[PDB]
Nucleic acid binder design. Structure first.
Ligand SMILES: Nc1nc2c(ncn2[C@@H]2O[C@H](COP(=O)(O)O[C@@H]3C[C@@H](COP(=O)(O)OP(=O)(O)OP(=O)(O)O)O[C@H]3n3cnc4c(=O)[nH]c(N)nc43)C[C@H]2O)c(=O)[nH]1
Ligand SMILES: [Mg+2]
Ligand SMILES: [Mg+2]
Ligand SMILES: [Zn+2]
Length: 354
DNA sequence: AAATTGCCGAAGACG
DNA sequence: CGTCTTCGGCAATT
């Protein structure tokens, strides 16, 4: 049965071809625009991210994530309160000076200009039906809506790229030592880290100047290199069911979110974070044999439910950042989700049949 | 130095 | 399952 669900979740190449062709055209055009000329974003480079490029996108290739990353040398980070994830950016006749607010590089000012330029360029596109979605307060994304004629959304994410050592709140994160190993962990942590203009929610409003850490590049690597054995899922190695379990859990949540508005606070990143923890807890590829899909999915569900119950789901890269804090998600919402998941779990997952 | 190019891994399609 | 294919990511090389 789970196999049948995975078959239906599996993307079709025809859909992939048609969607990628249009998405690539639109993005290539926006990127070229940024790169020329007298703009503060001139040196941005593209990094494709999220579920489509990690091969865990489900049902249809109808949502694409892409970062336009700007390398910003000599930036100084000040942790926003003790959040671990959120930062004020300051510096040691540059283009980003327009976005200053004191010594502080305002995420909001910079994102607003970035968004302005995207919109202007989108207006110039005549051969493709593309519009930009209304702004969502606090979000780092400029979201495009493409009609291909089928609906495809594309999040363009501005990011700052810093080549320095990662902020200390990440020091005991990425606990992959017994799974992917020490060389991998050390090498990953020598790569750049990113900041996206997602504002910290502070009480009733957002702090407009704040940025949030992003490890999209590291996560992409992990998804593509996820076995304790180097040949995991390769042509001369054994297939595991790690990604299949992730797809099923994402589907379960998507389906539940579709019919209950009280689940608005939950997102796929919660599921992705949960399974990162599970892959740490069960590092052996033998624990993710396709023959044991049902059992791996069940263990993931059990862990997720325990996260809910204990109101604790630590960010995988930033252990003191609790995604399931009361500040972020009300206890009642988490109890609501537990009930719905337990029900589906206890009754053969009827929601999988649409 | 911006743009093209092939290489080959991941995984869909098909029998 | 094996073989075929397309798309993405890389970086040399123009
Ligand atoms: N590259 C990137 N993009 C980030 C990001 N953080 C947020 N984004 C982009 O912003 C929008 C909205 O952000 P959000 O915080 O308000 O809500 C995100 C949305 C979902 C997952 O979105 P996704 O990026 O598209 O993930 P997929 O892996 O592609 O999965 P699908 O469901 O299959 O698409 O989760 C929320 N969320 C909460 N916390 C998040 C986080 O820390 N990182 C991410 N990526 N999402 C997070 C979403 C996205 O386009 C970031 O760090 N890097
Ligand atoms: Mg996505
Ligand atoms: Mg998205
Ligand atoms: Zn694998």
């Amino acid at each position: 049965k789970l196999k049948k669900v995975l078959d239906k979740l599996r993307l079709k190449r025809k859909d992939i071809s048609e969607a990628a062709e249009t998405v690539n055209k639109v993005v290539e055009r926006l990127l070229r625009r940024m790169q020329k000329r007298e703009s503060e974003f001139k040196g941005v480079e593209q990094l494709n991210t999220g579920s489509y490029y990690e091969h865990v996108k489900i049902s249809a290739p109808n949502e694409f994530d892409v970062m336009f990353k700007l390398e910003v040398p000599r930036i100084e980070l000040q942790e926003y309160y003790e959040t671990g994830a959120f930062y004020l950016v300051k510096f040691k006749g540059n283009p980003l000076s327009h976005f200053l607010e004191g010594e502080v590089l305002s995420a909001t000012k910079m994102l607003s200009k970035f968004r302005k330029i995207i919109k202007e360029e989108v207006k110039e596109i005549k051969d493709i039906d593309v519009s930009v979605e209304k702004e969502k307060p606090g979000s780092p994304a400029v979201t495009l809506l493409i009609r291909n004629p089928e609906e495809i959304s594309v999040d363009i994410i501005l990011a700052l790229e810093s080549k320095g050592s990662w902020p200390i709140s990440t020091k005991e994160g990425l606990p992959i030592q017994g799974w992917l190993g020490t060389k991998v962990r050390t090498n990953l942590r020598r790569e750049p880290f990113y900041l996206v203009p997602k504002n910290a929610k502070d009480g009733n409003s957002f702090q407009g100047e704040t940025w949030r850490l992003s490890f999209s590049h590291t996560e992409k690597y992990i998804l593509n290199n996820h076995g304790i054995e180097k040949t995991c899922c390769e042509s001369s190695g054994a297939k595991c069911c790690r990604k299949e379990c992730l797809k099923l859990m994402k589907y379960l949540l998507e389906q539940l979110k579709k019919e209950f508005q009280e689940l608005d606070a939950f997102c796929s990143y919660h599921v992705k974070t949960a399974i990162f923890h599970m892959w740490t807890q069960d590092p052996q590829d033998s624990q993710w044999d396709p023959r044991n899909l049902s059992s791996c999915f069940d263990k993931l569900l059990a862990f997720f439910l325990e996260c809910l119950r204990t109101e604790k789901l630590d960010h995988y890269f930033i252990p003191k950042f609790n995604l399931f804090s009361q500040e972020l998600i009300d206890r009642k919402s988490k109890e609501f989700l537990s009930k719905k998941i337990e029900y589906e779990r206890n009754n053969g997952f009827p929601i999988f049949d649409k």
